[PDB]
Amino acid sequence: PQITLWKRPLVTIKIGGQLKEALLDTGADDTVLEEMNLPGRWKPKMIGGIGGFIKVRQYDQILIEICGHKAIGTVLVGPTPVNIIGRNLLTQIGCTLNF
Amino acid sequence: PQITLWKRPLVTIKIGGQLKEALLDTGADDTVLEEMNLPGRWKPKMIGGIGGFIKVRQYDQILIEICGHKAIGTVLVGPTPVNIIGRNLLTQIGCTLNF
Ligand SMILES: CCOP(=O)(COc1ccc(C[C@H](NC(=O)O[C@H]2CO[C@H]3OCC[C@H]32)[C@H](O)CN(CC(CC)CC)S(=O)(=O)c2ccc3c(c2)OCO3)cc1)OCC
DSSP, X not given: OEEOSSSOOEEEEEETTEEEEEEEOTTOSXXXXXXXXXXXXXXXXXXXETTEEEEEEEEEEEEEEETTEEXXXXXXXXXXXXXXXXXXXXXXXXXXXXX | OXXXXXXXXXXXXXXXXXXXXXXXXXXXXXXXXXXXXXXXXXEEEEEEETTEEEEEEEEEEEEEEETTEEEEEEEEESOOSSOEEOHHHHTTTTOEEXX
């Protein structure tokens, strides 16, 4: 589809057996999701933005479905105020910017 | 242009007669630039990101040219980690997400 930017580009995603709403975020290198108890091993990480850094748990090789487009990659879990789909997964679903 | 997301979507902008690099950021409601001198009146504002809130200077009706496309709108100036072009201006240059 084509998503205009009058409002926040929110879409439904499926991860770890659950449905959620997440932002398609071209400014995000990585994908950051609200706190959730995924299984498996993880590695600590810190990611920075406006306001400073937050601590997150890096899970690798996680499947996410974004508007029916499947994508598997690294997902960070932590106290983010919003679920954020970053470029690591946006590339996998063929997402481009166009003007 | 059509911009893929394997690299950061960085572009050259022209504001206050000065060229800069900025990130096309569909996850930002507003446009936030690193500290710089801009003419005209401004009002203290605050914006929240991944790591909390910062203090910024709000400039309204600022002329800014993005990858050859002109926009006139609100530009926030403050301690952001990177120059970001937010949806308030992405809409003006006709930017959409597509996949
Ligand atoms: C909504 C309820 O909470 P809230 O109101 C705001 O919550 C939000 C809403 C949107 C975002 C997304 C964020 N947007 C943003 O900062 O925009 C602000 C300016 O415009 C305003 O409009 C929205 C917020 C304001 C960027 O798109 C992406 N970011 C990087 C970018 C930072 C400049 C470039 C470096 S990143 O998230 O930090 C990040 C992600 C993965 C990474 C990484 C860094 O590093 C490696 O991987 C984050 C928090 O207040 C909370 C205190």
